[PDB]
Amino acid sequence: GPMKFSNITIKNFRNFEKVNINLDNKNVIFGMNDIGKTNFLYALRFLLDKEIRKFGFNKSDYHKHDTSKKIEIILTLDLSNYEKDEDTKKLISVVKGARTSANADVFYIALESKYDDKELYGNIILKWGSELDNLIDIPGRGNINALDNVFKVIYINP
Amino acid sequence: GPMKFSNITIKNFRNFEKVNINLDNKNVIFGMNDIGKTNFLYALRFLLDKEIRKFGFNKSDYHKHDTSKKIEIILTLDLSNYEKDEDTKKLISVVKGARTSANADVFYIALESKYDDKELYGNIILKWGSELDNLIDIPGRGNINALDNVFKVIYINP
Amino acid sequence: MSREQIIKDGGNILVTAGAGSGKTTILVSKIEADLKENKTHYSIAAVTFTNKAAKEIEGRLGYSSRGNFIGTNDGFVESEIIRPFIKDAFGNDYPDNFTAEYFDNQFASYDKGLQVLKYQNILGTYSNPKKNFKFQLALDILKKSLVARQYIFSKYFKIFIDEYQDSDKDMHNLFMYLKDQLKIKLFIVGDPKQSIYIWRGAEPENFNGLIENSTDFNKYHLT
Amino acid sequence: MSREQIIKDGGNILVTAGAGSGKTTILVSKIEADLKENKTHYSIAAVTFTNKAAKEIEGRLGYSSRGNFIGTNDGFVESEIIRPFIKDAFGNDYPDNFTAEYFDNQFASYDKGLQVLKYQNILGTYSNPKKNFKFQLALDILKKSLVARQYIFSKYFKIFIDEYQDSDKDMHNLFMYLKDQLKIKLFIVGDPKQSIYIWRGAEPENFNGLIENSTDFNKYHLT
Numbered sequence: 218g219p220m221k222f223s224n225i226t227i228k229n230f231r232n233f234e235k236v237n238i239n240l241d242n243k244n245v246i247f248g249m250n251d252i253g254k255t256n257f258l259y260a261l262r263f264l265l266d267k268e269i270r271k272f273g274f275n276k277s278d279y280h281k282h283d284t285s286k287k288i289e290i291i292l293t294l295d296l297s298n299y300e301k302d303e304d305t306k307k308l309i310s311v312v313k314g315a316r317t318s319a320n321a322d323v324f325y326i327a328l329e330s331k332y333d334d335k336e337l338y339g340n341i342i343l344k345w346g347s348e349l350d351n352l353i354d355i356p357g358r359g360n361i362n363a364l365d366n367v368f369k370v371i372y373i374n375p
Numbered sequence: 376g377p378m379k380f381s382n383i384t385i386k387n388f389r390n391f392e393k394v395n396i397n398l399d400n401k402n403v404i405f406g407m408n409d410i411g412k413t414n415f416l417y418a419l420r421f422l423l424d425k426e427i428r429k430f431g432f433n434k435s436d437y438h439k440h441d442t443s444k445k446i447e448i449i450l451t452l453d454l455s456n457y458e459k460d461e462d463t464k465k466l467i468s469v470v471k472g473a474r475t476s477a478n479a480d481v482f483y484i485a486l487e488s489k490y491d492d493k494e495l496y497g498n499i500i501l502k503w504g505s506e507l508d509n510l511i512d513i514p515g516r517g518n519i520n521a522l523d524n525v526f527k528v529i530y531i532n533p
Numbered sequence: 534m535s536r537e538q539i540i541k542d543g544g545n546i547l548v549t550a551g552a553g554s555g556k557t558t559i560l561v562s563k564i565e566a567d568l569k570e571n572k573t574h575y576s577i578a579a580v581t582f583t584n585k586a587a588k589e590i591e592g593r594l595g596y597s598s599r600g601n602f603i604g605t606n607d608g609f610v611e612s613e614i615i616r617p618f619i620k621d622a623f624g625n626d627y628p629d630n631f632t633a634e635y636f637d638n639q640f641a642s643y644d645k646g647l648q649v650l651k652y653q654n655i656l657g658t659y660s661n662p663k664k665n666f667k668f669q670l671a672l673d674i675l676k677k678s679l680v681a682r683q684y685i686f687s688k689y690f691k692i693f694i695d696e697y698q699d700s701d702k703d704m705h706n707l708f709m710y711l712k713d714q715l716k717i718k719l720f721i722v723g724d725p726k727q728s729i730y731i732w733r734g735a736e737p738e739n740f741n742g743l744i745e746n747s748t749d750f751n752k753y754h755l756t
Numbered sequence: 757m758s759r760e761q762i763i764k765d766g767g768n769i770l771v772t773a774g775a776g777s778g779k780t781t782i783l784v785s786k787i788e789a790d791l792k793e794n795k796t797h798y799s800i801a802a803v804t805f806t807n808k809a810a811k812e813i814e815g816r817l818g819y820s821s822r823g824n825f826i827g828t829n830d831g832f833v834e835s836e837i838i839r840p841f842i843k844d845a846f847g848n849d850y851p852d853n854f855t856a857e858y859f860d861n862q863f864a865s866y867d868k869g870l871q872v873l874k875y876q877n878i879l880g881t882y883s884n885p886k887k888n889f890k891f892q893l894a895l896d897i898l899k900k901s902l903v904a905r906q907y908i909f910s911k912y913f914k915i916f917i918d919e920y921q922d923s924d925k926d927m928h929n930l931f932m933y934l935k936d937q938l939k940i941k942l943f944i945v946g947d948p949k950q951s952i953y954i955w956r957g958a959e960p961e962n963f964n965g966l967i968e969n970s971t972d973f974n975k976y977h978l979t
Binding site for chain 4: 465
């Protein structure tokens with residue numbers, strides 16, 4: 218099957234304490250807690266969009282304003298049909314290394330953030346790759362991350 | 376003498392074609408071309424303040440809107456009286472390496488930026504150190520640069 | 534008019550250029566044209582031994598958001614194929630960062646070279662001036678790693694090769710492996726009269742055989 | 757009450773703690789107190805051989821904007837003193853990135869070790885189990901580089917030292933050089949009864965001499 222999203226492990230976000238909800242390309246979010254859906258969409262923006270990362274996290278962006286906890290949102294991707302899926306090629310061309318030969322199908326994209334009290338600005342520390350155990354240093358050539366060449370968020374809101 | 380600013384080589388900025396005007400801690404800018412003074416202050420904000428780097432450069436931010444040229448603003452610092460100047464200690468504690476033993480007094484802080492036409496976003500690529508010829512890789516751990524622990528801009532405007 | 538033939542291109546292109554450079558301008562024109570007509574994430578790789586040639590190629594070309602690599606063959610391999618995937622292909626024990634010095638080992642047996650590389654971290658060359666061990670290592674890391682093959686397939690859709698008469702059998706095998714087993718387009722230019730680096734390790738007879746025996750690479754004559 | 761003596765601290769502090777850990781809680785309390793009362797850019801360095809001790813120290817401590825280093829002595833040196841300034845002190849020819857393997861060279865003469873380190877990139881230890889060459893290299897790079905001395909002076913105002921009975925003359929000389937020639941405060945704790953790593957290279961007689969002969973380090977008794 219073509220490349221598809223698999224899971225996002227949002228932890229200690231604005232309202233998400235610890236949730237691991239599955240995803241698949243075409244996603245629909247609805248129901249109660251409109252603030253919950255807004256926080257989920259902004260979590261995706263933080264994980265994928267550079268226009269939201271640059272503002273960083275605030276005191277309100279954490280769960281119950283508790284700055285001790287660490288934001289950790291981990292997007293999980295499934296890779297298959299390499300020779301025909303253009304988006305798989307797009308994702309795997311930018312990533313150089315950090316992909317273990319044992320599991321070439323799974324691909325994690327995490328986002329670790331710890332709050333410092335000496336500057337009151339939680340830095341967004343992207344740590345993506347293919348295995349949770351071992352992460353190599355992300356290039357991060359200035360403001361534009363290596364992820365910025367793969368995933369661009371087109372935000373639609375009237 | 377205590378640590379003092381020495382020079383800023385602003386090149387291809389909004390209005391500055393190629394200027395190398397000396398600085399010294401307490402600086403006063405005045406005269407004609409209020410837009411020129413505003414551009415100089417915003418150049419200092421780009422070189423030192425993280426709250427302005429994150430927005431990056433635009434088409435208007437270049438000289439005569441010519442995206443072919445490269446923004447290169449190089450702040451020059453003079454270091455002396457190490458044992459008594461606290462700000463010298465502040466600057467040299469964060470910088471690990473990239474300081475040649477031949478010249479421990481001079482310290483450059485450049486800012487290279489080239490415009491890409493495939494995304495229309497000129498990335499701010501900080502390259503600071505001690506010699507123009509050889510620059511080591513800047514840490515850049517996420518949004519906060521290593522410079523962000525040294526120079527913080529306090530912008531005052533009624 | 535040969536300009537029309539240059540513009541129309543089409544797949545792999547082999548040009549029998551003359552001496553006194555000349556290949557540089559057609560290389561720059563082909564690179565610029567390929568970048569202009571392309572509209573996808575596919576990158577390009579142009580490789581040249583001459584360092585100042587790489588410097589001028591970078592200088593006359595503008596900044597590209599998509600990663601385009603300009604460098605030397607050994608630097609190209611040791612940069613993108615060896616350095617990242619050495620831990621993935623051969624376990625975490627193998628070192629990732631290293632420097633190349635040709636005049637350290639001077640061994641005679643492949644097994645001894647393997648042992649000294651694995652244990653003492655030293656990377657050199659054979660006592661025989663012919664052949665380069667770096668490209669054999671690139672073949673080895675490509676063969677048993679699907680990640681490296683996938684990365685090479687997805688990143689570059691056409692790899693530009695310069696002064697191919699200097700190539701020996703090792704990088705020839707690497708380029709043919711990328712062309713056939715990875716279905717990656719190749720743009721190769723070479724001068725039959727530039728066979729002067731033979732003592733350095735160059736054996737262009739394979740290139741001449743591809744000129745004659747192979748049929749996929751169409752031959753073009755440039756004035 | 758010894759809690760008042762712990763809180764009041766003052767300059768260098770030497771504590772004769774007992775076995776069964778115990779030093780860990782006073783170390784954590786001292787680190788937290790020093791971070792709390794400090795209001796400047798001065799950092800702190802706590803070093804411990806035990807890796808899980810470093811892991812728990814990092815876990816129980818929060819994120820600090822100012823760089824606080826937690827690691828092992830050899831890792832500490834090879835990370836911040838050797839890696840960045842090796843090119844500045846000894847020219848661009850010396851390698852900057854390398855891995856430490858103790859069981860490679862096994863030499864007998866210092867000159868031979870110098871040659872093999874300079875040429876073959878290999879870094880090991882003496883055939884004599886006593887002494888560590890890494891700290892001698894740290895002394896050498898500190899002596900002839902003003903940049904390294906300035907960085908060490910400005911970065912850390914008090915370096916915390918743990919299980920000092922395991923220290924030999926080399927890191928003892930390094931720490932004394934930082935304390936005297938750089939006027940950097942030192943917080944050292946050690947157990948006189950923990951002299952069990954003697955075969956590994958530890959010679960605590962210098963530590964006992966500092967306990968007796970030296971006067972700057974006040975001795976404290978902990979229940």
